[PDB]
Amino acid sequence: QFGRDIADTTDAVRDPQTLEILDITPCSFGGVSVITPGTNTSNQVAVLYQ
Amino acid sequence: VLYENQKLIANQFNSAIGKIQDSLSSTPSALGKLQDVVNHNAQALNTLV
Numbered sequence: 001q002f003g004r005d006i007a008d009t010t011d012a013v014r015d016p017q018t019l020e021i022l023d024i025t026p027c028s029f030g031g032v033s034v035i036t037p038g039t040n041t042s043n044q045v046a047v048l049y050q
Numbered sequence: 051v052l053y054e055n056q057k058l059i060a061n062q063f064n065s066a067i068g069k070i071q072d073s074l075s076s077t078p079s080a081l082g083k084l085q086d087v088v089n090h091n092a093q094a095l096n097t098l099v
Protein backbone atom coordinates (compact mmCIF):
# COMPACT_ATOMS: atom_id res chain seq x y z
CA GLN A 1 0.00 0.00 0.00
CA PHE A 2 2.48 2.66 1.15
CA GLY A 3 6.24 2.87 1.56
CA ARG A 4 8.66 4.12 4.20
CA ASP A 5 12.40 4.67 4.60
CA ILE A 6 15.20 4.43 7.18
CA ALA A 7 13.96 7.41 9.23
CA ASP A 8 10.45 5.86 9.72
CA THR A 9 8.84 8.47 7.47
CA THR A 10 6.39 8.05 4.60
CA ASP A 11 7.95 8.55 1.16
CA ALA A 12 5.69 6.88 -1.44
CA VAL A 13 1.93 6.28 -1.42
CA ARG A 14 -0.47 4.49 -3.77
CA ASP A 15 -3.80 6.04 -4.66
CA PRO A 16 -6.87 3.76 -4.75
CA GLN A 17 -8.38 5.28 -7.91
CA THR A 18 -5.38 4.36 -10.08
CA LEU A 19 -2.72 1.65 -10.21
CA GLU A 20 -0.09 4.42 -10.31
CA ILE A 21 1.95 5.51 -7.29
CA LEU A 22 2.65 9.05 -6.10
CA ASP A 23 5.81 10.04 -4.23
CA ILE A 24 5.74 12.23 -1.12
CA THR A 25 8.34 14.93 -0.41
CA PRO A 26 7.67 17.55 2.30
CA CYS A 27 7.24 21.23 1.51
CA SER A 28 10.53 23.14 1.40
CA PHE A 29 11.25 24.50 4.88
CA GLY A 30 14.25 26.58 5.84
CA GLY A 31 15.49 29.12 8.35
CA VAL A 32 15.89 32.79 7.52
CA SER A 33 18.88 34.99 8.31
CA VAL A 34 19.45 38.74 8.10
CA ILE A 35 22.70 40.05 6.65
CA THR A 36 23.25 43.43 8.26
CA PRO A 37 25.96 45.97 9.03
CA GLY A 38 25.77 48.22 12.07
CA THR A 39 22.63 50.32 12.41
CA ASN A 40 24.90 53.31 13.05
CA THR A 41 26.22 52.80 9.49
CA SER A 42 23.15 51.97 7.38
CA ASN A 43 19.52 50.92 7.75
CA GLN A 44 19.52 48.41 4.87
CA VAL A 45 19.46 44.64 5.39
CA ALA A 46 19.82 41.58 3.16
CA VAL A 47 17.73 38.43 3.56
CA LEU A 48 19.45 35.03 3.38
CA TYR A 49 17.47 31.80 3.07
CA GLN A 50 19.22 28.69 4.40
CA VAL B 51 76.63 13.75 7.25
CA LEU B 52 73.85 15.11 5.02
CA TYR B 53 76.29 16.21 2.33
CA GLU B 54 78.05 12.84 2.19
CA ASN B 55 74.72 10.96 2.04
CA GLN B 56 72.40 13.18 -0.04
CA LYS B 57 71.47 10.58 -2.67
CA LEU B 58 70.79 7.95 0.01
CA ILE B 59 68.54 10.32 1.99
CA ALA B 60 66.66 11.33 -1.17
CA ASN B 61 66.10 7.69 -2.16
CA GLN B 62 64.96 6.74 1.35
CA PHE B 63 62.55 9.69 1.53
CA ASN B 64 61.06 8.94 -1.89
CA SER B 65 60.67 5.24 -1.06
CA ALA B 66 59.00 6.14 2.25
CA ILE B 67 56.60 8.55 0.49
CA GLY B 68 55.63 5.87 -2.04
CA LYS B 69 55.25 3.32 0.76
CA ILE B 70 52.91 5.55 2.75
CA GLN B 71 50.93 6.36 -0.41
CA ASP B 72 50.39 2.63 -0.96
CA SER B 73 49.73 1.97 2.75
CA LEU B 74 47.03 4.65 3.06
CA SER B 75 44.97 2.56 0.59
CA SER B 76 46.10 -0.97 1.50
CA THR B 77 44.98 -0.78 5.14
CA PRO B 78 41.18 -0.39 5.46
CA SER B 79 41.09 0.51 9.18
CA ALA B 80 43.50 3.48 8.96
CA LEU B 81 40.69 6.08 8.98
CA GLY B 82 39.09 5.41 12.35
CA LYS B 83 38.51 8.87 13.80
CA LEU B 84 36.95 10.70 10.83
CA GLN B 85 34.63 7.80 10.00
CA ASP B 86 33.64 7.47 13.67
CA VAL B 87 32.84 11.17 14.06
CA VAL B 88 30.77 11.34 10.86
CA ASN B 89 28.98 8.08 11.76
CA HIS B 90 28.29 9.37 15.28
CA ASN B 91 26.83 12.58 13.84
CA ALA B 92 24.67 10.58 11.40
CA GLN B 93 23.45 8.18 14.10
CA ALA B 94 22.69 10.98 16.57
CA LEU B 95 20.70 12.78 13.87
CA ASN B 96 18.89 9.55 12.92
CA THR B 97 17.88 8.59 16.46
CA LEU B 98 16.10 11.93 16.95
CA VAL B 99 13.85 11.28 13.94
Ligand SMILES: *[C@@H]1O[C@H](CO)[C@@H](O[C@@H]2O[C@H](CO)[C@@H](O)[C@H](O)[C@H]2NC(C)=O)[C@H](O)[C@H]1NC(C)=O
Nearest residue numbers: 001002013014015016017018019020021022023
Ligand atom coordinates in the same frame (compact mmCIF):
# COMPACT_ATOMS: atom_id res chain seq x y z
C1 LIG C 1 -12.47 3.29 -9.09
O1 LIG C 1 -12.90 4.41 -9.89
C2 LIG C 1 -11.93 4.87 -10.85
C3 LIG C 1 -12.53 6.08 -11.52
O2 LIG C 1 -13.47 5.71 -12.51
C4 LIG C 1 -11.59 3.74 -11.82
O3 LIG C 1 -10.58 4.18 -12.72
C5 LIG C 1 -10.97 4.04 -14.11
O4 LIG C 1 -12.37 3.72 -14.27
C6 LIG C 1 -12.79 3.60 -15.64
C7 LIG C 1 -14.28 3.35 -15.62
O5 LIG C 1 -14.57 1.97 -15.78
C8 LIG C 1 -12.00 2.49 -16.33
O6 LIG C 1 -12.38 2.43 -17.70
C9 LIG C 1 -10.51 2.75 -16.21
O7 LIG C 1 -9.78 1.66 -16.76
C10 LIG C 1 -10.11 2.94 -14.75
N1 LIG C 1 -8.69 3.24 -14.64
C11 LIG C 1 -7.86 2.55 -13.86
C12 LIG C 1 -6.43 3.00 -13.86
O8 LIG C 1 -8.24 1.61 -13.17
C13 LIG C 1 -11.10 2.52 -11.05
O9 LIG C 1 -10.88 1.43 -11.94
C14 LIG C 1 -12.12 2.10 -9.99
N2 LIG C 1 -11.61 0.98 -9.22
C15 LIG C 1 -12.12 -0.26 -9.27
C16 LIG C 1 -13.28 -0.47 -10.20
O10 LIG C 1 -11.65 -1.18 -8.60
